[PDB]
Design a protein around this nucleic acid. Structure first.
Ligand SMILES: [Mg+2]
Ligand SMILES: [Mg+2]
Ligand SMILES: [Mg+2]
Ligand SMILES: [Mg+2]
Ligand SMILES: [Mg+2]
Lengths: 182, 272, 229, 21, 48, 127
RNA sequence: UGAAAUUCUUGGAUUUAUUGAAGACUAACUACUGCGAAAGCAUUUGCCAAGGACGUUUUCAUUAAUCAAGAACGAAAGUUAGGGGAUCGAAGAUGAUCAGAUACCGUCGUAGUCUUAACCAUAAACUAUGCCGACUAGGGAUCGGGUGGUGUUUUUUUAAUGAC
RNA sequence: CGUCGCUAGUACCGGAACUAAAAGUUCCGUAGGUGAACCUGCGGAAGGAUCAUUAAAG
């Protein structure tokens, strides 16, 4: 194990969430992954380093860096902890404009369609496909297993293209039933 | 899939066919066969082709144990891949997924039927009947019209079909001219395709496009086997004498396109 | 496709056998940075051994972070390009070729509720190095400011844009390429921008985004050995 | 089958944990 | 129709086969694959 | 004692390229893609193919003499998505699993200030 | 691409790096915030004229509101004649036609997409809501101007301005 | 337990012999359409389901 450092810069809007949530962020990194943790107030970035005398898993540094990135992107902490617990979880990201060029309220309505009432549509995707979704304005992030995120993306893309939420929800119960079977 | 539920239209279609007892009718995709049984009554021999085996069996069950059973013949499989036996008349409820190839296959088949009564969607029907200067006049209308004459019998409402299709359809009659006019099919289509890239264009505008001008030049050198600017000059001339270059493709009648073809053959350039 | 069942490719029809390991014939070569930088060692490269090796070496451009060369994390977000100019005994002499920031740093600086001001200038040095500079700044809100945003009127944006432009053209013209790079590292330039633009409107995050070398003078190896000491 | 449409009290790490156990 | 008859009459005078002639169907293509070129070379070689 | 390379990773939707070169980039040290290491075109973009792709590059780099690499991840960019996919993420982890020291990680995905029209058309694509 | 084949590729494809050429277009900042009669309008700089609002103890003195007739402009698409032709792309051609969440996918691509000189004058051209004038509640944000403060910061000599 | 077949093979002069054969979304305007129960290009509309975060010159 060699001395290696990772720097993950966080945007300003995630500062306050970290400060209140950081009490639960540094423990798992320092105890389970055995990393040396700082966040630089001057650069507003999170710094992780392998301790040569203590670190044993060489992948703990990158595993921690991805975990910080997930919280940086907007995922809830417990969801971000899944990255540390697991090794086969990835973040898929894309923009609505990639699917289709929507502007003005058309763009706004598409975002509403993805979220659904009270966020109802989004959680249906999350429970059906075994993933978590962060809908940051026109930017979408999906966290989960490679197959699962692929199953999550197709549904939100369908909603972007203009498929009604009800029909999409009908597809979700079908795939959810298949998921339980396998 | 839709099914027609109006008995009057089915009876009308048979009557307009005016099948003689001597003649033999060909049916395509009879399905339920409510139209079919009437045709058997007035037809000596009926040949039926059905894509789905079960429909044919059920049709067998409708003509089951009847004197008309011996006269009726049942066939299976897509009509295209098969070679259809000779038939005097064709009246059928063809799917529109295959209407356009079907109508041409009937024309292309040697010894084609003298009259046929077929159903097409309204937009296709207008295109079949579109005449020079009409809004719906298209390349397909010019091609089919020259080979055969088509007339609109009636319009069938969507409500009559169940489940109702979103697009209405109209029964139409087509009769293939006998003898067929003596013009090569490929050459005619070659002329039509270039001139109907955009009906509202000038006929000269279609020709001056770079890509096809390569094709015409390649074709011309082949005729010599049997100077690209020279070919451009010759085309520019022959349009001027014919005067067709100024005229819109849509306005020009079938007779006008013949003046286009003959003049090109004089130059020695042949479409296809 | 990798599978044998894949339809035979045009290249696959006749295949040249791989009988030589390329790196048997390759020769390692060491790069050195100008004397303007603290850490002259910037690694090594490899080339086919001369049958020449020098021709491939010349015109080779290497990009590297400024933090490695200056040994300070303050320059982690800054990147510099160096082109090989002369070769001597496995040591590849390089000169400044260009500079730019990391994508992550740039996306950081752009934020909502504030005005992004950009200025560019095409200008030459005293050493006849024609180059293009790109400078960026952002409006900021005052300490006691209570308004959410800090947008500036288009008049100020123009009024700032002349100040950045007249400054940038001044130092470059009154400096050589080596001296110009020497200004970039402590980044004295922006501190001059901040003072000049201070009265017009408060700004933040003032940086020279990118440097391009549009043209080069006739090569002078004497001007290169002196730069390398 | 009706799919839960509200926020799952059980987190992803817990969801994958159940799949193992 | 009479003018249609005479012009049809003239067309038989100038008639030729269409096997070698490139179809107008190619107008949209604009670029040919390596396989398509080989038939054209084969066809032209057959023509001599 | 530490010779540094450049690991350029290109994570596309249908494949992932793991490319290691000298610091300049003119000289390719080893180019590997997911397609080489999988029997079906389905999993060329799969994370599994990327991991096999990454390990083979890493073993080759040790043979050459390279001991550390700087990672330049990128996506297709241009008129398409700007963020690397799971295939790129899996490859980057695999480099850590191989043992190559990672010098610096940065994303070099092409971002247009202005771009031409997309292949989708008005109604969109990616059904 | 849900799956594959047409497609390019040992004359080296894809990918890497140093460049050059062409034609479109102004990302992130970007906000139903701003301007314009509407349609519409986002790089820098210069020139040409135009305009809303504000200040005014300056000027004319009913010169005004609405508008058949009549006139200018009018998104996208569309027509004529030149230029240009990167990307995308009606039509056409062609690969595949197996599997229903991924069921319409792929390659080539004509006209067009850009521009010059004229026609065409149509949109859910929407606030599905004529124009002008008066009056009828509280609340605090934004944009432009103006007034007041013995308010903060800067001018790092003061200050005066600028920003708050 | 028998006769004649049928399938594969070997040779012989259609004919005549031999061997083997154990499985079970809704539209507007315009322009087009030759695998049209409908498709396609351009621009516009909602008469279409807003979740999370968000003072970081803090
Ligand atoms: Mg503004
Ligand atoms: Mg206004
Ligand atoms: Mg033109
Ligand atoms: Mg509007
Ligand atoms: Mg009023």
């Amino acid at each position: 194990i060699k001395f290696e450092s990772r720097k993950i810069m966080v945007p300003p809007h995630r500062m306050t969430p970290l400060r209140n949530s950081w009490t639960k962020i540094y423990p798992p990194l320092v105890e389970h992954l055995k990393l040396q943790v700082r966040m630089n107030l001057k650069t507003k970035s999170v710094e992780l380093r392998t301790n040569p005398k203590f670190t044993t898993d060489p992948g703990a540094l990158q595993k921690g860096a991805d975990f910080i990135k997930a919280f940086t992107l907007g995922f809830d902490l417990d969801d971000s902890i899944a990255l540390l617990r697991l090794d086969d979880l990835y973040i898929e990201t894309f923009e609505v404009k990639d699917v289709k060029t929507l502007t003005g309220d058309h763009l706004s309505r598409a975002i509403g369609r993805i979220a659904g009432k009270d966020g109802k549509t989004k959680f249906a995707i999350e429970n059906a496909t075994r993933t978590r979704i962060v809908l940051a304005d026109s930017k979408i992030h999906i966290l989960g297993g490679f197959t699962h995120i692929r199953m999550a993306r197709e549904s939100v893309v369908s909603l972007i293209l203009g498929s009604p939420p009800g029909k999409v929800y009908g597809n979700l119960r079908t795939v959810a039933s298949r998921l339980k079977e396998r | 899939q839709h099914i027609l539920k109006n008995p009057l239209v089915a009876q009308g279609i048979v009557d307009k066919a005016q099948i003689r007892p001597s003649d033999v009718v060909l049916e395509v995709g009879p399905g339920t066969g409510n139209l079919t049984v009437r045709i058997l009554e007035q037809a000596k021999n009926v040949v039926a082709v059905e894509m789905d085996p079960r429909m044919a069996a059920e049709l067998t069950k409708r003509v089951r144990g009847t004197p008309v059973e011996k006269k009726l013949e049942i066939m299976l499989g897509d009509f295209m891949k098969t070679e259809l036996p000779y038939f005097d008349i064709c009246i059928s409820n063809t799917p529109y997924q295959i209407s356009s190839p079907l109508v041409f296959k009937l024309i292309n088949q040697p010894r084609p039927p003298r009259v046929s009564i077929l159903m097409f969607q309204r937009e296709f029907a207008l295109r079949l009947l579109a005449r020079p200067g009409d809004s719906l006049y298209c390349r397909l209308s010019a091609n089919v019209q020259m080979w055969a004459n088509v007339t609109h019998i009636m319009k069938v409402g969507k409500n009559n079909f169940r489940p109702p299709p979103q697009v209405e359809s109209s029964v139409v009659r087509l009769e293939i001219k006998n003898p067929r006019p003596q013009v090569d099919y490929n050459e005619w289509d070659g002329l039509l395709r270039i001139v109907f890239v955009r009906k509202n264009r000038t006929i000269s505008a279609g020709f001056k496009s770079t890509t096809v001008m390569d094709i015409l030049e390649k074709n011309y050198k082949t005729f010599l086997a049997m100077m690209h600017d020279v070919v451009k000059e010759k085309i520019d001339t022959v349009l001027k004498e014919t005067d067709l270059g100024d005229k819109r493709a849509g306005k020009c009648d079938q007779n006008d396109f013949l003046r286009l073809l003959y003049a090109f053959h004089q130059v020695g350039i042949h479409f296809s | 496709a990798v599978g044998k069942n894949k339809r035979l490719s045009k290249g696959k029809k006749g295949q040249k056998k791989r009988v030589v390991d390329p790196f048997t014939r390759k020769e390692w070569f060491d790069i050195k940075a100008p004397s303007t930088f603290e850490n002259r060692n910037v690694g090594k490269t490899l080339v086919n051994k001369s049958t020449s090796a020098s021709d491939a070496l010349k015109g080779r451009v290497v990009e590297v972070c400024l933090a490695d060369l200056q040994g300070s994390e303050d320059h982690s977000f800054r990147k510099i390009k160096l082109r090989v100019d002369e070769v001597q005994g496995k040591n590849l002499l390089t000169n400044f070729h260009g500079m730019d920031f990391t994508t992550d740093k740039l996306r950081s600086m752009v934020r909502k509720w504030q005005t992004l001001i950009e200025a560019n200038v095409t200008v030459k040095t005293s050493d006849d190095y024609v180059l293009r500079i790109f400078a960026i700044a952002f409006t900021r809100k005052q300490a006691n400011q209570v308004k959410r945003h800090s947008y500036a009127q288009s008049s100020h944006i123009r009024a700032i844009r002349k100040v950045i432009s007249e400054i940038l053209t001044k130092e470059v013209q009154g400096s050589t390429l080596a001296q110009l790079t020497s200004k970039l590292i402590p980044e004295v330039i922006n501190k001059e921008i901040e003072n000049a633009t201070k009265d017009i409107f408060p700004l933040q995050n003032i940086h020279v985004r990118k440097v391009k070398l549009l043209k080069q003078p006739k090569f002078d190896v004497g001007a290169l050995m002196a730069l390398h000491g | 089958f009706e799919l839960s449409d509200v926020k799952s009290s059980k987190s992803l790490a817990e969801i994958y944990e159940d799949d193992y156990t | 129709r009479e003018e249609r008859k005479t012009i049809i009459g003239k067309l038989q005078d100038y008639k030729i086969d269409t096997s070698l002639l490139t179809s107008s169907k190619r107008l949209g293509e604009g670029r040919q694959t390596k396989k398509e070129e080989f038939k054209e070379a084969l066809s032209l070689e057959r023509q001599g | 004692s530490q010779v540094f390379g450049v690991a350029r990773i290109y994570a596309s939707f249908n494949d992932t390229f793991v490319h290691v070169t000298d610091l300049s980039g003119k000289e390719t040290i080893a180019r590997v893609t997911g397609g080489m290491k999988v029997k079906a075109d389905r999993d060329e973009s799969s994370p599994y193919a990327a991991m096999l792709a990454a390990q083979d590059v890493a073993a080759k780099c040790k043979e050459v003499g390279i001991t550390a690499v700087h990672v330049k991840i990128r996506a297709t960019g241009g008129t398409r998505t700007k963020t690397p996919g799971p295939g790129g993420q899996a490859a980057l982890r695999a480099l850590a699993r191989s043992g190559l020291r990672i010098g610096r990680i940065e994303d070099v995905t092409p971002v247009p200030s202005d771009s031409t029209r997309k292949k989708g058309g008005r109604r969109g694509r990616r059904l």
